[PDB]
Amino acid sequence: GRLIYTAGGYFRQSLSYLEAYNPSNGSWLRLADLQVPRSGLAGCVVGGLLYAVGGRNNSPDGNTDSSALDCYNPMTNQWSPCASMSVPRNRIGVGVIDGHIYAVGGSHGCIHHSSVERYEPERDEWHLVAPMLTRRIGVGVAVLNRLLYAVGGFDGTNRLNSAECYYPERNEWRMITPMNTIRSGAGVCVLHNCIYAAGGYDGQDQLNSVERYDVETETWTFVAPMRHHRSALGITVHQGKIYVLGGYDGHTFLDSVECYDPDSDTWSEVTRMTSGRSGVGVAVTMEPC
């Protein structure tokens, strides 16, 4: 589109912020709040609607996992409720294929989901598809060549370097080559022919390392590390550059936004969020009004 939207997140408690960054002028706009605070959600866009999916409201009144799908229209600057998912999914991953949204894994209390469901905007309806081979929360999800990939995460016991691929016409998951790094709460996105996995948590450390999967070669390769170690980051692609937003470095809920240039293999500090936060949902679409 034209703007990087960041929704929700966590600082001290789950957040309701919706803010949009303009790479062209470096500015931030605060837009309409989410109706319910949530961290550990995912964002995506389909047909110029921004969607906020799953997560959890960590608050002093209690902690509630979210099965919610909420619809944001930039023309109106209004959030509307859309169909809820079959199940709450905190620390969810999301992918869009052919205008359908795939909601992947995430947790509900001590339940770590391997289940996967698909949203159809024309019908405002969720349907379960084949489950992943592994339970994954803090799962990175990306789409390339109309195939969905679930990358790393946490299965309830172990943080994962494993990854798998969903073939829609076969309704089937298959393992792919595992990453060289255990990552839970990495940022996962696609750029050209490669699935990137940036940062994450291995159970001891928040990571600055970045690696990429070439679907043709089936191998993962390290690229330049980010400037900041970060888990529970938001990630998006805007005009052939990767943007990473916030996260947690073991000390600070980061406001730092970094930008990856694949030609020069370099990360650069691009802006700061209006406040530090982790577990945000990020997506790109056109300006509001």
Ligand SMILES: Cn1nnc2cc([C@@H](CC(=O)O)c3ccc(Cl)cc3)ccc21
């Ligand atoms: C203390 N700490 N630092 N980074 C962390 C990441 C997670 C993961 C989940 C896990 O692997 O247990 C995580 C948290 C939030 C999000 Cl949005 C994704 C993944 C949990 C605790 C962490």
